[PDB]
Amino acid sequence: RDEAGITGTWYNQLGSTFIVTAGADGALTGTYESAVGNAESRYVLTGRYDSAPATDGSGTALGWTVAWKNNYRNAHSATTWSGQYVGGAQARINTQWLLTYGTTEANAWASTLVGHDTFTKVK
Amino acid sequence: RDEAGITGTWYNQLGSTFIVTAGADGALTGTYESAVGNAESRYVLTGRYDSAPATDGSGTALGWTVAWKNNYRNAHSATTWSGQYVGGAQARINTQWLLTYGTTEANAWASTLVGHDTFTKVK
Amino acid sequence: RDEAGITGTWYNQLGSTFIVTAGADGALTGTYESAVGNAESRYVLTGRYDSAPATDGSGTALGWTVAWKNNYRNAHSATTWSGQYVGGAQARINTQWLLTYGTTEANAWASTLVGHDTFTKVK
């Protein structure tokens, strides 16, 4: 039961800010602000997490999406982060991500960036 | 404006079924049923898509998450698909995905599978 | 023992041409010619494969790299394909790949594309 452990404000290694609420039902809702790329201000996110994780010391699996459209800009792209929450004194969300841009069929080979973000509760 | 083009029932190459509604606001909601893996019946999904895509022939970026917990089972894992919708006679959603399982810190190197799913409106 | 099954000329879905020799010792050597991207003519490749695969119907794991420098151009990038060879009437190499471009530290978040290529012995 990591609803309280997940909910809150998280920061990654780029200085991006992830503001999330975890629902009792497994939902993730909030906003993402990227420190880099074709982005400004906050963007909607949604996602899901395992609301009944294993009790053996394993992390808590979760994921979320941002489409990079808001009232300021549209980067015609979406990122998905997939990862796990690891609780404790220095809690962390360890993620890998896929960023797809909309492309023509001819350029679709080149549509998707992959990377990895680690989030902490301290900047 | 691909709200009508996205909304509906989609099937991938594995015979999985993706049932989605696209909101005017960029939301994706629905259910996923996997034909493979530690899964049975339907699981909640949510996600986002570019509600104002480019008009140059590019695809429509989107993503969504499933956490693999429902009333039947809990696979302590989450998958994120990231991709684009390509409209037309044979419409398609072309995706890559990341499946993270909850692990101990010692096994976290091995936590994440990557793959690729192509969805069609016909089985 | 898939040395004879791997060695030869392969083509992917983009119309790229992969010319490989598999060594008894697990080596892969040859040349790659991409139909797309910042590339022309042939580039050196090397890689490795499992020279003693399982006999249970499993595929044969393998991988290879291309750095995108030759006498014509230098795209300051390297792609790695990781996958498996599946023997038989319609033999295939099913791969996923990572293409890293050299970046400054500020842009390294955006350095790596991911995709998937399927190779056949017929175009």
Next chain:
Amino acid sequence: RDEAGITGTWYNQLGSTFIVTAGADGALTGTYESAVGNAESRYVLTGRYDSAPATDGSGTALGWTVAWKNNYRNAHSATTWSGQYVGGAQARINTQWLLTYGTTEANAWASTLVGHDTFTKVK
């Protein structure tokens, strides 16, 4: 020209040891010893790097493969790392990797793990 900067012994965050020689011609040769997984002792590697990188502060793209067969064991798998070398006082190779295991056609959806390794010249 990073031939001297790449050649040598590198260690990642898992305590794996990567011993590589960079050739003037773009080759990478050496041995890999994993601290984790179905592995013991050293395994052959080969790969490629950009021997004429940009002079603007960008990193040096490179990649390499290991098939996880040696005289001790065979894990019927191959990993490819794709990344860049970043020179200087605290030199680093920043990589993402794809590990494919040989599978039956029914389980091929689950064949490939993805992760990220950072190598340093100090443990």
